[PDB]
Amino acid sequence: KSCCPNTTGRNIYNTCRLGGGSRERCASLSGCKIISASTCPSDYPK
């Protein structure tokens, strides 16, 4: 799932995972926020 203030980041996170890359690897790549239990933080999933 993960949440990102801009699809630009969610893109790397999403594609990253789509390419077999840990959630953290992409997180450090773009800068999205990693949540838990799916539920997203405030409301910045894109």
Q: What is the DSSP string of the chain?
A: --B-SSHHHHHHHHHHHHTS--HHHHHHHS-PBP-SSS--SSS---
> Interior CA angle at 6 toward 35 and 18, to 5°?
65
Residue/partner pairs of 32-36 with CB below 8 Å, 24 or more apart: 32/2, 32/3, 32/4, 32/5, 33/2, 33/3, 33/4, 33/5, 34/2, 34/3, 35/1, 35/2, 35/3
Tell me the two tokens of residue 21.
């890359």
Domain that holds residue 5: 1-46
Cα–Cα distance for residue pair 24/37, rounded to 1 Å: 16
Tell me the two tokens of residue 1.
């799932």
Contact 32, 13 (CB under 8 A): yes
Kindly report the CATH number assigned to the domain that includes residue 42. 3.30.1350.10
Number of domains composing the chain = 1
**Scanning the structure block, which residue is given the tokens 């239990």?**
37
Please state how this structure was obtained.
NMR
